[PDB]
Symmetry: D4
Subunit: 219 residues, 8 copies
């Protein structure tokens, strides 16, 4: 378990992170974390490591792109003095290119995305114990579907950044890809983005595996 | 994994099982399974065993005792033709004795509890592939608190029926007891009964472990 | 114009047809026809052929398959004594196979679909002046996506019944396909099924063209 | 098609334009345009010219007279940097004279109306590719009904302005007049102002005809 | 005053009579009589003839034609044992011809109107002390508007039945006509049917004058 | 009729005047005047004198005492530039003495009441055509009931003020007293203050009689 | 204390008893007893006699007269097998005579009141351990107010039945009368019937004193 | 009775005091005091000492610790110029230690609690006639339950402070302890903190006993 006792773990992202969490503070055991993967992570950490006393904060905001993260980073991240920051962003940065292909101010292209995400990591790294970069995802098994193909480009950038900055790394697309060998996307999310409890569990598990969570502790 | 491909798993119980499930069907949407351990179970099974093709049904009803289960058993269990039935009942059977001590017809005392639950297990066993008996629980660490002491006795009844009937058995009290070495009850549930996400994860993990779930499959 | 003065045109289908229509009557206010292609059809007919005096009824019901149509056919179609019946069914028959793959009784497979739809068309044809058969559709441009591939097969069934029965025929998939040369699905419908105003205009225009509507009447 | 690819088309007016559109921005494919003729225009343009990539904004505000348009013109029009502006105003400027004939500060008389509308056109013309002036209307077939007779005076002024400024021109009253040869007003709008889907389609079609929309493109 | 001490006066009609009255009783609170002319009548009678001890019942139902009255006559009129029955019906009988011209079964044409209303008056007259027949009305000053022209014909029917049957008679159209020498319809009712407080006062005053009310009693 | 054409009549008072009127402006034919005596007055004036073109504004505010009137007089009265002001105040000034007999900052005693009301009249008189002073009231027939006895003292002061300032005068208590010879208070208002439609008609009539309203005009 | 351990005490009445109690059971939660004197009684008994183990049921129904009690007596009283029945009825029996003087079938005059209440007491007495008869009341200090005078007569009937039948007896009017030496009615209840917390405490204290409650137990 | 006529009694605390009281003023006989022990105290004082004319204000705020009281003391207490101040605080100061044992900024430890509470008393004492210190409580009969054991430490501090400052003193824990000899906590409050009407009556009675309330006055 990478996260130590008494430490503060902060999640940021878009609606997949937000999941109806309490605004502004996003902190507490009884609904304030929202109802998706963040909450599941905390639940599992408390069920299996209750003695760790890990404080968890949810700063997800529905609709955000990486440009929106940068715009609130000082207030929502820096000022919170976290020990661990988990970032999952990119879905909207890409989706807007496909659902509003002519409202282009809504799009964040890849080279802007890469530099902005890097800028967030590099600002934050000297202030925290660790950073966890979660790729965006798209629940779609055809690599050549245009949005899936774009999303994968953004996920490759995330991986690159994590390597180069010594951040932890969660490939959420690889986790979905496995389940997509069996299930058609609609069984997980009609819109291919916002999933079921199952999708959130896929994400929660992917995150917990990367931080060295044990389902039954050996120690 | 005790549960196998193509099987229908039906959960029944009180509010801990219900958690806002869709009535009457308790199946078949996103959200139809409720927002507690039953949903978490189905999500983790889907995340880790997507190919198993399990159908899951949530017949939990808030407020039920085992007397209420008996009254709807035919329509809600037997008529559903499940392959597997999971029962978690007893919390209200006990809690009414303590919160409404003078309304005795709302109590289900130990003789009624054992005979009824026994009868339901005996009746159902030959019609299904398997039964899972979950103990009720009380989120309270002091064995001599009166309601914890009573709830532990009711759990002994469940354990003994499961043994007699070669049912699977989940000791939910023991799962909470482990966490209660560290956390005061209120950290998990103000009222010592209806817990947080963490509590429902304690439950879901206790269920899954009993049915041979692996967090990361070795094969 | 195939539809003539004084005729009653009854539309039946699933949510794509329903679009919040008034239940049970589906006629006779402002708003009773719902807010999608059925209403747009009635509006354009009124704008361009005000003198035609068409009565229009919307018997769409959200969630329906052709099995559901059959169960209400007598009350909702035959008892209404329509002159013209428009049917657009199949989306849910197919989508349940993909979004709830393990709940097989909710699926309407191709044998049940063809026999039922056929039976309804055969039964209705001698009681009415005319039938319009609209294909189901899936807003997805890749023919080998599994649900698009299945939906195209169901459309072939509709086309063949319409041919056998000398019904009018609207290929809604082809209409979407044309736009999908330019737009990614999400621009029209996140879930690839329930579209925007633009999608409903694609539908209404496909219907109208089949019934000989002219945007500006040449006579 | 007068409108070219990538261009921005902005509609302004009163409730007939507003139709519940999103405030303040009035822009987007999924409800932000409101539910009347603006939305229908955009829907048809996307269904038939999807590749044009026309951005559309709805700045209608219920209750407005031309005096209200002038009061918000800088923020709602100029600042938006549209390529094409469509104006439909006058209904309220006239209605108030008839429904609140003694709260006269609510009235905009014809010579004030004419000069204010001219002032809007002349300010805007050097900043855009084109302007479309839609007459107000009143759904009433008797030319001598007092409100209809007044409304027609205002429509004549609009036509004059469009001629003199080389603006495009939509005679909405002429479009209703045709349908009113068959339908009594109440079949379109009980209040003779705010119509049904049919009325909105009459308006949408009138607008699309003036911009050179083709229902089936020859090219 | 035609109405006398201790008598029960029952009003029946459509929405103009209903005005949100309490269903089913239409009597007996504060507010049970609705918020239009029926309530105003009861208030003025109470203000000026408090000692009369009149019981008043409002059996108006929004949307009703005389065909609807007939279907509930036994339960809503005869079973109430009124001493006086006031009927104001015809607006919807006529308006459906104009707002839904093609839904002919919703129309109540003049032959059905005269026969039904006649039958109800003949049947009720020997069971009660008196009947008041109020004409329907249309708030429209042009006699040749088609719906006003039709409504005036229906009023002639009412006047003739009242004459034949020695019923009291209230010409509501004439009352509106007087005000319409000064006000355009919209000042009283946008839709020419459901008026303001002023319109309901026009009605209440027309009723009261017919029953010999004095604003200031001379005795 | 004391009120001439084109003139502005403003009512101020407490909840008996307010009756849910539109805040802040309190002006319009379709609900803005609220649902009690103000609205009835306007309704009758329009039904019988439609050609007068009297503008009416309702500045009633529930809970007000005369001290509250003074606090808003500049904004709510002076600034409105009325031609006629009607004041009805005192109910709360007195009620508070009886319902909150120990929260005394809520009480306005008689000599404060008298001087404040005088101050309002004397400020306003040089700015308007006329002032109408309506007494407060209490719907209670026993002159010696403590609140009734107090209320009458306040009504005597109002009368004195009106005499001394040449204001018009409405004795609302005398109007209720007449009806109270027959009806027990509860038949008009359970709380003896806020009446039924009948009470509002008693008030409306009292006001209209003082301004020279004719129910059937001789001229 | 007249009530003893293990006994079921059932309260019945009108709104004063109901106070929002849970329907139909009126027992068994927190809140099921309503928010007035019945709840206060149960609370004080629990605070001071926790060991008594009393079951309490609230069968009050807003609006009831003794005629309504009779119609539900079998289901709501006798079928509950109470040991003690407390009845407080008469307020509406009387108040309808005054607030709806002309709707005579809603009145329960003294002959009907005495015979019915008598019959219910006689019928119930041999089936239960004891009966408590509470007078109705009117919060009004003037004995010659007409409704107070009538209510006092109805109270005399209750007192006489209680005497005849050796029922316990609570004179609620006398309890209010004592406070009314100091407070005007409006301080306790604007409408002289439905009081504040203070009024319900007056009631609860009057009940408790009659059943031998001690505020501080001497033993 | 320690409280004299005309005096102002102000209660402050957490949710147990607040009970939904009116914000900000917390003053009035008809709901403004909230629905728990404060309201019951006032009710009893009015029922038994109506002539005292005691003004009562409720400044409870749900969630408060003693640190929160200090933060609002000037506005909510000092500025109100009370004659008597009742303080009940500590529940949250302690609860947070047990329900959010790792969000420690939410905890107020005992020595901070003691000094802050002292600081409140010492500031206030020279400004008022008297102060009443009510201990916090926890509805839990086992002295060794961790939260109960902590709560008792805080109650001992309260008692010490009251002794040292000559404040009145209410041991709310001792009052619950008596009832807990018979009832399990859940019969009074599932969460062991927020009780039933019974709990509020236990508190109300404890407070009234300390101020010398007599249930039947000797004088
Ligand atoms: Cl999002
Ligand atoms: Cl439960
Ligand atoms: Cl559907
Ligand atoms: Cl408008
Ligand atoms: Cl109607
Ligand atoms: Cl008021
Ligand atoms: Cl009642
Ligand atoms: Cl609290």
């Amino acid at each position: 378990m990478k996260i130590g006792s008494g430490e503060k773990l902060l999640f940021i992202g878009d609606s997949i992170t937000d999941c109806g969490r309490a605004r502004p503070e996003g902190e507490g055991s009884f609904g304030a974390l929202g109802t998706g993967y963040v909450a599941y992570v905390v639940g599992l950490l408390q069920a299996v490591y209750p003695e760790l006393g890990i404080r968890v904060v949810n700063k997800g905001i529905s609709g955000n792109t990486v440009r929106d993260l940068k715009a609130r980073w000082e207030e929502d991240v820096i000022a919170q003095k976290p020990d661990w920051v988990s970032i999952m962003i990119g879905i909207n940065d890409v989706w807007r290119q496909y659902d509003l292909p002519f409202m282009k101010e809504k799009h964040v292209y890849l080279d802007e995305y890469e530099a902005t995400l890097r800028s967030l990591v590099l600002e934050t790294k000297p202030l925290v114990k660790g950073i966890i970069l979660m790729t965006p995802f798209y629940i779609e098994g055809n690599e050549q579907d245009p949005m899936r193909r774009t999303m994968d480009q953004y996920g490759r950038v995330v991986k690159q950044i994590a390597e180069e900055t010594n951040s932890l790394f969660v490939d959420t697309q690889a986790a979905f890809n496995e389940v997509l060998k069996t299930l058609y996307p609609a069984a997980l999310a009609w819109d291919r983005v916002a999933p079921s409890v199952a999708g959130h569990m896929i994400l929660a598990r992917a995150f917990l595996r990367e931080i060295g969570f044990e389902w039954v502790r050996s120690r």
